[PDB]
Amino acid sequence: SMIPDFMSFTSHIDELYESAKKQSGGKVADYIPQLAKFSPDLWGVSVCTVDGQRHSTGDTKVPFCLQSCVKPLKYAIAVNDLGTEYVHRYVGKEPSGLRFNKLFLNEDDKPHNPMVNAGAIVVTSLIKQGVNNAEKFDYVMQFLNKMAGNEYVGFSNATFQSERESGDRNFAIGYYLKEKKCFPEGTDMVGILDFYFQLCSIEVTCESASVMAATLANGGFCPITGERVLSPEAVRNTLSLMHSCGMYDFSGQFAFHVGLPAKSGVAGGILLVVPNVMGMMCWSPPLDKMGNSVKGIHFCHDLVSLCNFHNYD
Amino acid sequence: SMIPDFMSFTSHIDELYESAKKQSGGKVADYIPQLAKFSPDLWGVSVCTVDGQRHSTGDTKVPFCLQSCVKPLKYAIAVNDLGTEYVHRYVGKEPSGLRFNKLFLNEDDKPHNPMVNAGAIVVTSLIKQGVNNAEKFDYVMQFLNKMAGNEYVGFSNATFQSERESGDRNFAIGYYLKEKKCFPEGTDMVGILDFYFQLCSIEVTCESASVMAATLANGGFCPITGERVLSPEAVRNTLSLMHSCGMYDFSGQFAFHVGLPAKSGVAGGILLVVPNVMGMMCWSPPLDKMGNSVKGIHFCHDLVSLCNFHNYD
Amino acid sequence: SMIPDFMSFTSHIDELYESAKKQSGGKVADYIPQLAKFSPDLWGVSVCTVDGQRHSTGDTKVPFCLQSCVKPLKYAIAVNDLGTEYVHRYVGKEPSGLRFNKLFLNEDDKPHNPMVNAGAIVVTSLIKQGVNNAEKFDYVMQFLNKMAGNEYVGFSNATFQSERESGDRNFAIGYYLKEKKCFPEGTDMVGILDFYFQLCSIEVTCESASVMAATLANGGFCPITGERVLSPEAVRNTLSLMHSCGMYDFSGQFAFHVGLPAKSGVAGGILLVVPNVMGMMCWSPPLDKMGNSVKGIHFCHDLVSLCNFHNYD
Amino acid sequence: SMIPDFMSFTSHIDELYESAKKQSGGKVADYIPQLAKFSPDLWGVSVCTVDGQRHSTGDTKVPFCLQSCVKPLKYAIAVNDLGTEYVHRYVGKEPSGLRFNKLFLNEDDKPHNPMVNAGAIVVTSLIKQGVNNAEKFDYVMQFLNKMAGNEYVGFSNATFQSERESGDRNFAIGYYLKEKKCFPEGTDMVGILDFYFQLCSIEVTCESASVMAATLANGGFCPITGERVLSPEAVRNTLSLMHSCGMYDFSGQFAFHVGLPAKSGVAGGILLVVPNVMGMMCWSPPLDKMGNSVKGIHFCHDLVSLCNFHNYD
Ligand SMILES: *CC(=O)CC[C@H](N)C(=O)O
Ligand SMILES: *CC(=O)CC[C@H](N)C(=O)O
Numbered sequence A, B, C, D: 001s002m003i004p005d006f007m008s009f010t011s012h013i014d015e016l017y018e019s020a021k022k023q024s025g026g027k028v029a030d031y032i033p034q035l036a037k038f039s040p041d042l043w044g045v046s047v048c049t050v051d052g053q054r055h056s057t058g059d060t061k062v063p064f065c066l067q068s069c070v071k072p073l074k075y076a077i078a079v080n081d082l083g084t085e086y087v088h089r090y091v092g093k094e095p096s097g098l099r100f101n102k103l104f105l106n107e108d109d110k111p112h113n114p115m116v117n118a119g120a121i122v123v124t125s126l127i128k129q130g131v132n133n134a135e136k137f138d139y140v141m142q143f144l145n146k147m148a149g150n151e152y153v154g155f156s157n158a159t160f161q162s163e164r165e166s167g168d169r170n171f172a173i174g175y176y177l178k179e180k181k182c183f184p185e186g187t188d189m190v191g192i193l194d195f196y197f198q199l200c201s202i203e204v205t206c207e208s209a210s211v212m213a214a215t216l217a218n219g220g221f222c223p224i225t226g227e228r229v230l231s232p233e234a235v236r237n238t239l240s241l242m243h244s245c246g247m248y249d250f251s252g253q254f255a256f257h258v259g260l261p262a263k264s265g266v267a268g269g270i271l272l273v274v275p276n277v278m279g280m281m282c283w284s285p286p287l288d289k290m291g292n293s294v295k296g297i298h299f300c301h302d303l304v305s306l307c308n309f310h311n312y313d
């Protein structure tokens, strides 16, 4: 461990939190009213160590939607249940060339990776096939509860309804993937879209999410229950792709400067993993031009430059 | 006129027809059974001069679907009813860079031109807005009857039903254009898709189609009725775009070597215009790798190399 | 002929000239001092009919460099001496997809067409192979004299020297084409670049250039000498490509709205052809964002909208 | 440490070596005779731990050229002498979108990263500016000697001469970067190319190279001399970019499946780093379709799947 005194570490998290707090730039997402509602001043950071030690500061009990933060989690589930090889017959393993989610496939007509919409849509089609959407949803909720050691995991029906109604681009992607035969045989593509919108609409708090991150940090064992949630293979794949593909078009800079597996989402969440050390969830709705939470980005840079957490430190 | 003796010209058309007939390569389209049905050996050529003189050879009374051959016709209708400026607020004026129908927009987020699917879908949304799809369809059928001087214009319901069921790519394009706000306000995109599939499913014969081509060749006046069908502006726009965008990825080579406005379709039709001389429709189901009728392409090359019909001869 | 009274036509040219004159926008090219020198207020239009009738207005005797205006001319020479088939083993036949001169090749690793730099560089390598650069240059000067019926054809040594010194992009293209084996065996690529810079540096006046344009308008016969300068094949190819590829990224709009073969150049020249009617050269140094002379573009639009000269009028 | 018994580890390296040995596919590079000379059956693996423990098997004393293996090393030197911020004013920080070395720049007109040719060419221009090429070369040779703890570092004059004569693509890149102003003011671009060719032509053995790799594995301290060669910042940057950009178009798959910083080269070398554990150099001339040594790739996969060396194991 690189944290001898947890309490002193705590004291530093608070200092970084406080420094990030002064960063007021960015714009709260407003493509649906359920995101536009949110106050720009909301800002929470929660830590859950591999030990099971906890620390929160700021708004760490206000629920918000995982949104793209869910992409690594459902990917992790797919690999856990199906293994690396099956999953990757359907989706690639690396950063899309140009901009994030520009609607195309790789040389093999597979979405580039699970962290872009096309890829997450396909991953969604792989999970618990055969059963109805209601059972699919329950199965995943249950899985996230395990990842979160039974802490806050809810569902925003209003976000779901708005996502489905306004999600023209995701429908375009759905039909495109159908044309290119990207789904396993017998897939109801529209039903898969619905399931996808639902998954984006799952709600968490910084506190519960940090436990999910910590489970990934802990080889797939939930640090506050001790139970095995994910296969080692699942964790490793997920971390690799979070490392390279997790921060939209900022993934490259993030890997270089921060060097940690992370996944941002349009609600302003940033799911952060320090392998063998801790999980974290940082949350603040206002987003930069690349769609990453302004405060969270700032906090991540400061955290690594302070605690020498970079992959290659 | 560049045809002093029509009868002698006739005799030459027959020779070219006969030479093209020996070209057996290519593949009949089979993405729907309504296209796969067709015999590879079907081959017709019909001419209608600006004078109103007629000549057919081969299978010139077997109905087949316009398919993309309809794109210039509905574009012509849009401009006729709405003028160049309005239409082109919605669709561009030039060859898409890369491959034909690769799903993207130009710098202004407009489809590149009316001869690609995205562009024709948008053009379809412009026609007779406000009225229901049934009236839209009738209005256009009536318009084509005028273009064809009341000769064969029918409708393939089976093609329509199959186009809608198998048209995932067109649905992707529909949703993409909706996301990018490419349609006039208050557009039912799905309804527009339906209308689009219907238009592709309109049936003609070489004989009736050649009269449509001749109307374009004749400044928008139907050479066998004498009535004005299209505005001069409409004809000129349509010819310009047929010249540069009408033969899929072969448009460039076709312009260079043949130099005539034309529009191919997946049923194997090639609508050909010799400005101020005649209209023609050539038809043969087997298509080359670029989607153009093998016999028709061969015939077009021979026709120009013989009668010096090239734009810049 | 579409010009019954030449004198009345003359009177109209003057009106259009005068209207264009009020268009003061645009920027004189300044990448070399030899272009930056030029006054923005210079503006000339010269007409030479297929008959041999002449008319000039404004600054039609001030020499300026052909620059890219030379591309169609040397292409025409290559085809004249070597035939279509040989030339096009080396260069394509159609508009490059994206922006003009973005440095790449087509599917067959050939430059897209002769009107872009990569293509003109290759065309230059085809002309009078075997002889030294001095003889190559003389041969071409002589050819242009024939095209111009012995009117002004000079050479700007200062432009040449500056083009070679500042032409890093053309050197990059030279080496790229060498890597991809785009030149005939035994080509001195650097020497070909030199020759290319020289050709760009050939000087003309509106008056002499319009005779060159008129020769193209007249099936390759110089209207003021009556001698055959270019093969019919050469003229037709050149016109086709001028039609589609001649106005940089504005080629598409120009074809649609004007419908005439033309070729612009960075000195502000626009070589215009009205097939079977006349040649023209319009010249005014200030260029729009696409590199086309602002006054010339304006004048071309007005000319067609007035005299119904559009290809498909 | 994850190696308790070095001798037992040794025994396993030998087993993997032996297994890789049976992989006979791939093609020895032949774009210059100096590469084509090499036997396909040559195959060496050398390990140098952070401890300073050593082990070799196979052809680990036959000199070969670093080629692209040098890219991370000179990048490391640039950052060491100039700091991250200066270096990255000139070159980017992340994987190029499409194929490796396809000749273009990022949004800011900088080469995408130091591991592609355009980027390494620019990095080369940054080193020891002001002094002549001879001193530049000596300075770097001296630096590599330090990295290698004074083991084999030579120079292939024949490779240099052939690289310069056949390097048309690199010259194209040189001129392109000059046009786009990618070099620090006052750069002799041609001289920089020369220097670049020289650096590619530096010779090493598996044994000496593994010590260079080990220096990177050891926070920039040479494990067999104990001296500080590189700044911590330099090492971390280099490792990050090796991780994401080091294996040409295979970088994505390599990161996912192997999860180690590596850099391949066309001579068949693969410079491998296991942070805080060891450096390795694997070498075998025959390359796969992506330009990576067939045996080395195979060996790397097996090594991680055996010793759990993956970044996220
Ligand atoms: C990755 C992100 O949060 C965007 C989420 C949104 N629902 C989408 O585009 O699917
Ligand atoms: C242009 C062509 O004939 C393809 C027609 C087909 N229905 C389509 O892709 O819309």
Ligand SMILES: *CC(=O)CC[C@H](N)C(=O)O
Pocket (backbone or CB within 6 Å): C066, C067, C068, C069, C117, C163, C170, C200, C264, C265, C266, C267
């Ligand atoms: C086509 C044009 O006038 C640009 C000319 C200039 N010399 C060049 O880029 O070669």
Ligand SMILES: *CC(=O)CC[C@H](N)C(=O)O
Pocket (backbone or CB within 6 Å): D066, D067, D068, D069, D117, D163, D170, D200, D264, D265, D266, D267
């Ligand atoms: C990266 C690699 O080894 C190719 C090296 C070669 N000299 C080059 O293209 O510069």
